[PDB]
Design a protein around this ligand. Structure first.
Ligand code: ZN
Ligand code: ZN
Lengths: 144, 151
């Protein structure tokens, strides 16, 4: 079972870097991995001090600050100021999708009874729910 | 339909097909890719001949050969990605659970929820679709990881 959200994020980060003439270095890999895996919301300073403590490889604060800006610009992370900006992964609300296997037709939908059961499932297992992915597959009326 | 949604279950199938080919020392070619794509995007239970003829009609530029059609089907059958009768083939579409993933430690919880299942059947009926499958992943942070740095 692969984590689709993480796989998507990692490919998008690499796509952006290839487009900017930049390499997927071990510094950049640990930065994205830290922001995805940690449940602490970092400032550029605390992200830089955290990676210093976990990986004295590198990595300087300039590299941290440029990588956060590339991520925010791409809307892969969101920042919030309050008095150093704190960052977290973007979890923009999105619709779910049903896809016709035969013609590729895509129908968007959102269902509040499903939404409510998804929060209940997280809660039954002690999880804090942060995102979801839900696709339905079938054959549309015109293809059938 | 103006929207780019990657079909996750199809990508999982293609990755498994790539794994099989690499195991059998075969290159992942456009000819082999179009065969898996035809099996998935159709309800027909093809035979090697009818699958050859369908690809010839739909993608004549690729010139997919009959030897490649049999060889690929035999490879997919040995891997249990397809089942056959007498031969006529059907892609395996085995029941599966839904999964919840901790973003920090990566632990996975498998689950099924009957309320969600019923809503999925109603959604499909409301749009005149015949439901054949689904995929649902929930993302979150487990009780061991909550407010913790990266494990
Ligand atoms: Zn259709
Ligand atoms: Zn965890």
């Amino acid at each position: 079972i692969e984590n689709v959200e993480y796989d998507v994020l990692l490919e998008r980060f690499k796509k952006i870097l290839r487009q900017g003439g930049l390499k997927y270095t071990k510094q950049r890999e640990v930065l994205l991995k830290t922001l995805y895996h940690s449940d602490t919301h970092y400032t550029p300073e605390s992200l830089y001090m955290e990676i210093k403590q976990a990986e004295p490889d590198n990595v300087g604060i300039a590299t941290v600050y440029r990588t956060l800006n590339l991520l925010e610009e791409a809307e892969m992370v969101t920042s919030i100021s309050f008095g150093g900006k704190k960052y977290e992964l973007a979890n923009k609300p999105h619709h779910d999708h049903m896809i016709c296997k035969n013609c590729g037709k895509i129908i968007e939908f959102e269902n509040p009874i499903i939404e409510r059961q998804q929060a209940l499932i997280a809660k039954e297992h002690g999880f804090k729910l942060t995102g979801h992915l839900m696709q339905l597959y079938g054959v549309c009326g015109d293809c059938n």
